[PDB]
Design a protein around this nucleic acid. Structure first.
Lengths: 129, 88, 218
RNA sequence: GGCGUAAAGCGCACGCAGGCGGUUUGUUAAGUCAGAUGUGAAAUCCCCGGGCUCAACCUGGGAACUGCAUCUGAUACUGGCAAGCUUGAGUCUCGUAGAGGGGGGUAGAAUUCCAGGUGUAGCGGUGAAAUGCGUAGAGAUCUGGAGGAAUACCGGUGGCGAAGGCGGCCCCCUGGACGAAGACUGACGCUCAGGUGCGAAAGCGUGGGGAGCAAACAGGAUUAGAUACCCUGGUAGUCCACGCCGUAAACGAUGUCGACUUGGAGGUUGUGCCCUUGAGGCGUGGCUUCCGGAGCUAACGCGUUAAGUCGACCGCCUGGGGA
């Protein structure tokens, strides 16, 4: 039925942004709030908030500035059945360097920048522009 | 189709502190009580594939809940299948 | 505009589903447009129309229903804005290469009515052979001097004058319209809140639209 | 790469062995990522110094060959193993509809058959006609009676069932689904090769059955011919005891499973609330029909019950003519 909490994470954002919505909401998880913390730090979202005594649900706010969507690509890359792993110089340059990638690593969720700066590689989790 | 009055003779013996009726040891007994009742049922009569599939559904859930109990605690599994008919 | 008034009760029912971002519904047996997505825009909409008028943009007013035409013509007949107050012609702005010859046919049939078989002392029935003229004037009479393409459309109802909105969205021209829960949210560039029970009281809003297209000192 | 049709999604239910699986902690280090020491033969690519002009070739120095092993970090995720949970999944108190199944029954009508009356030359049938039924008294109309099958009406905008299919009233036996207000377990889930079980019509077996319909057949014809359409008769088959068969235009031609998300009109079944003082009004779950929007699609269609948006698993597939 449901196997992967990330398989219904980014669809909401890609489809809600197409519906011209200012906020998008999802069921919360450790990796969902770890990705959101980096997407706020890199400025891809404005803020995020999480609440629920029965089920904790996470709402994040989308950037449009004065009308036009600020995130010009939202992709996953990698899936649990067929994972993508990149080494310290095989780390990607998303949108030929106009975008960024996010990796999980042994030091916890970080950018392809922070991983290459740490001289290390790991598993892919997100691709954005 | 099994009464609250027939369950009162199952949840009394297979329980321990009450309410325990959600637990595997009691649900395997409540499924066995329905399986063994819907086994006969048949003879006289045979030609009803709906209640036959109902019986095989209850058996399908019991097989799994037995395997699951055995996968949590072997002693709580063996101490149930001496009180319910299994492996002759 | 702060008036507005009191009504009880309307729209139970009666909505275009493309309005879901702008509407409150599925509760309290109402379907109502959010006052926070009409008034905070309507207090800041006419500045964007004065922005078109101040650069000599050509302004068009539309309202062809008898309870609105009486106020729409009274707001355009001695004004810079052009009008249509009785009926539309097919392709009256989009089919420009043909409509420009239709504006010329207002001279052709007028001069035909003074030529040959029509230059007679009796015209009683004869001038019914040129009645194509007043049939064409019925559409062109307030816009025949406009030419080419307009720069803004104002329309007294976002749904009852839909042909003018269809012409304007093909021609790429901004539309300012009074809205209703059954109208389309995609054909309009600036929305105005109002009710059809107030179609004779909104003459103050038309007053402000007309005042906005004469502010300047440009 | 592709599975609505153009070519492939299994007619259906359950499920072992396989693939896949929420979440708090620790720990293992198979797998990943990081660092080394060995090795990765020489020719040789590519950089580059000689030798013949350029180069084939002989080479002098470099590089790469992401590999693999042996030592050693990171300690995050996946598998594994324990310990801990639930708001994933499940069952239920009082309760809800249904042509679902099985067993019992249980009721009515006409062609027919059976014994006759009343009664006279007609009946039957087609686009035309004719075999044929009829003076042995037909057709039709009555009296008293036998036989076989299906269940008129309401019936639909509708239900149920795994599909195939299934409407009566009345009495048992029974699967699944669904609502209100709560609770006990604690990932127990999703899928599934080969299995394990289903059948509409027709067909095969053993014994019965025979109104109506009717293959085959024998006639009437019709016609150039008629071996057929159309008309007159009519066995098999249709029904039942069962036992077999397993296939379909098994069709909204759309595999199973889950989430997210514009509607309208309408049906059907629970149910929360206002003295229902309730006819009314305000809500809300389940099932589902037609019209259609963003998206998808070659196009028609699919369209919140999506052929959409995205994931887990399975089943398939690469042109007709031949086959």
């Amino acid at each position: 039925s449901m196997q992967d909490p990330i398989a219904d994470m980014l669809t909401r954002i890609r489809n809600g942004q197409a519906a011209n919505k200012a906020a998008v909401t999802m069921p919360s998880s450790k990796l969902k709030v770890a990705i959101a913390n980096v997407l706020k730090e890199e400025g891809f979202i404005e803020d995020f908030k999480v609440e629920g005594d029965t089920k904790p649900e996470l709402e994040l706010t989308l950037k449009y500035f004065q009308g036009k969507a600020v995130v010009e690509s939202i992709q996953r890359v990698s899936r649990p059945g067929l994972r993508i792993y990149k080494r310290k110089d095989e780390l990607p340059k998303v949108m030929a360097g106009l975008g960024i990638a996010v990796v999980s690593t042994s030091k916890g969720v970080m950018t392809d920048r922070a991983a290459r700066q740490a001289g290390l590689g790991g598993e892919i989790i997100c691709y954005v522009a | 189709s099994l009464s609250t009055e027939a369950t009162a003779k199952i949840v009394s013996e297979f329980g321990r502190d009450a309410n325990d009726t959600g637990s595997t040891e009691v649900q395997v007994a409540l499924l066995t009580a329905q399986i063994n009742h819907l086994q006969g049922h048949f003879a006289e009569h045979k030609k009803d594939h709906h209640s036959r599939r109902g019986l095989l559904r209850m058996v399908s859930q019991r097989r799994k809940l037995l395997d699951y109990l055995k996968r949590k605690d072997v002693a709580r599994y063996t101490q149930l299948i001496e009180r319910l008919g299994l492996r002759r | 505009m702060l008036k507005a008034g009191v009504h009880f009760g309307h729209q139970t029912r009666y909505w275009n589903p493309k309005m879901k971002p702008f509407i409150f519904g599925a509760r309290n047996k109402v379907h109502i447009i959010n006052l926070e997505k009409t008034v905070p825009m309507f207090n800041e909409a006419l500045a964007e129309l004065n922005k078109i008028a101040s650069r000599k943009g050509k302004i068009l007013f539309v309202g062809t229903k008898r309870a609105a035409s009486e106020a729409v013509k009274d707001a355009a007949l001695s004004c810079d804005q052009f009008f249509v107050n009785h009926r539309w012609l097919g392709g009256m702005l989009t089919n420009w290469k043909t409509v420009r010859q239709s504006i010329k046919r207002l001279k052709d049939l007028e001069t035909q009515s003074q030529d040959g078989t029509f230059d007679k002392l009796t015209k009683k029935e004869a001038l019914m052979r040129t009645r194509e003229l007043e049939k064409l004037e019925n559409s062109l009479g307030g816009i025949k001097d406009m030419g080419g393409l307009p720069d803004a459309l104002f329309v007294i109802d976002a749904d009852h004058e839909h042909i003018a909105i269809k012409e304007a969205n093909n021609l790429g021209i901004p539309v300012f319209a009074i809205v209703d829960t059954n109208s389309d949210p995609d054909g309009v560039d600036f929305v105005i809140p109002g009710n059809d029970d107030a179609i004779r009281a909104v003459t103050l809003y038309l007053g402000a639209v007309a005042a906005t297209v004469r502010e300047g000192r440009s």
